[PDB]
Amino acid sequence: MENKIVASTKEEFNTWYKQFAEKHKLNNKYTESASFCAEIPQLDTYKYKMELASTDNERDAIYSSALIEATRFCAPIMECAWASCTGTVKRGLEWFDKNKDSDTVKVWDANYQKLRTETPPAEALLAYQKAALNWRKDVGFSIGEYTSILKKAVAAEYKVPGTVINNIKEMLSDMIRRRNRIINGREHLDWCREFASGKFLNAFNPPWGEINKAGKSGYPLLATGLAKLVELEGKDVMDKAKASIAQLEGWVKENKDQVDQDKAEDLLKGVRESYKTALALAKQSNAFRAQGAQIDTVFSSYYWLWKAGVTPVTFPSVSQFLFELGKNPKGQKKMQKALINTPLKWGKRLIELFADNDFTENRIYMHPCVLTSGRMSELGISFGAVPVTSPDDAAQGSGHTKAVLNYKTKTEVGNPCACIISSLFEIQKAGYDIESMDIVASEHLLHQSLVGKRSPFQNAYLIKGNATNINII
């Protein structure tokens, strides 16, 4: 049981990877990172087999067989190997020994048993999301685009082929409808947007009346207005609002001779109260509670290993387990038996972290540290695409759902990412009742693809904008 991907620095890993890549002839023709993808799999045969299937096990077998076929050869071999390497493994686990007692980790880890049943508070999500960015900085996880924090804007348009466009619009429409269920004075929004975007002198002339006028709810209209702008455009609006209010202070002190200093101070104290009231409403809202529960794949992966008592000695058994798991068409219930039956100790402890039975609320709200049967794909993509005890076996191929994000987005090669996502959705709706399911995996794959997530190992919590507002073309 030796981890054969030996590399304790960025430079030592590159010497391993270039040696591995030129051996196996890794192909970046159809994928974003270099992979074993020599062709785009045509999955329509599974959609038609699914139409004819009668029992639930057959549909599970057809659906998993479709996912294996789709994903087995197209894993990001650079980023997978980087996550699984001896350096990243030792540093990644030991961070939790170093950081468990801090504010950003303890709020969710010490309450793990509570979060298995209950939905988390808003600050526990913010704690998690800070700790994830701390983990990436302290370990030094970024070695390029596909392992970095994304700080980009959401794109205005998303370019899909003509053969799939109709089904992509049905998925997005269902995502819009799902966004509306979790959620549940017209020029005010346009004025509040103008103010936040930089026109700070608007605050002297609020169209409703005084700057701190309360609406029907009893909350300031500037707070309500900024809070609704968070739900429509994203939490980037509150960063812009704080930048505008700073300029308002700068102008009032630059031009004290033009103003009544009492009413200027009553204005600035009023705007700061409405800003904090807008933060309180945004965190309290369901739109944030879903957004904040976004899993950082590799961070939560390493958290679950540390929670199950895994060390650098026992890591290769986990990597080897996840590799073999992604080869056979395995239903989620069969995997639970495999973790029970395996004599290794982590196998038992990892099954006890599952929260499949006892979570009554909507699963989108579940805190992203809690493991489930579906979230084993987060571990599978992290450590399972390349087995560390025998790296060459990767050429066989190990299917993981998060390997679909490695497919290209470019119309030059027919946009294989959108075609696989579209085809997988047709397979799911044919076999399973879609609106009964809380999270549909193909809709979750599309949501990441829309916001510009090109790899499972990227963090994308700090993306400016919404996937909901995008146009399909």
UniProtKB/Swiss-Prot annotation:
Q: Which keywords does the record carry?
A: Capsid protein, Helical capsid protein, Hydrolase, Ribonucleoprotein, RNA-binding, Viral nucleoprotein, Virion
What is a single cellular component term in the Gene Ontology annotation? Answer: ribonucleoprotein complex
Site note Cleavage by host CASP3/caspase 3, residues: D260, Q261
Intracellular or extracellular location(s): Virion
Q: Report the domain of life of the source organism.
A: Viruses
EC number(s) reported in the record: 3.1.-.-
Q: Give the residue interval(s) assigned to the motif DQVD.
A: 257-260
Q: Where is this site: Homooligomerization?
A: F204, W251, Q258, V259, K263, L267, P343
Molecular functions (GO terms): hydrolase activity; RNA binding
According to the UniProt entry, the coiled-coil residues are: none
Q: Which cofactor does it need?
A: Mn(2+)
- Major location category of this protein: virion
| Free-text comment on the cofactor | Endonuclease activity is stimulated by divalent cations such as Mn2+, Co2+, and Mg2+.
- The record's account of how the chain is modified after translation: Cleaved at the DQVD motif by host CASP3/caspase 3 in mammalian cells at 48 hours postinfection giving rise to cleavage products of about 30 kDa and 22 kDa that remain associated. Only the monomeric form is cleaved. Little or no cleavage in tick cells. Caspase cleavage reduces the viral polymerase activity. Caspase cleavage is not required for productive infection in mammalian or tick host cells.
Family from the record:
Belongs to the nairovirus nucleocapsid protein family.
Domain remarks in the entry?
A: The DQVD motif is a CASP3/caspase 3 cleavage site essential for viral replication in host cell. However, the importance for viral replication is apprently not linked to caspase cleavage. This motif is involved in homooligomerization.
Describe the function of this protein: Binds dsRNA and ssRNA and probably participates in the packaging of viral genome. In the dsRNA binding mode, the nucleocapsid protein specifically binds to the vRNA panhandle secondary structure formed at the termini of viral genome. Does not discriminate between viral and nonviral RNAs through ssRNA binding mode. Displays dsDNA endonuclease activity that is sequence non-specific.
User: What protein name is recorded for this chain?
Assistant: Nucleoprotein
Its ancestry begins with: Viruses, Riboviria, Orthornavirae, Negarnaviricota, Polyploviricotina
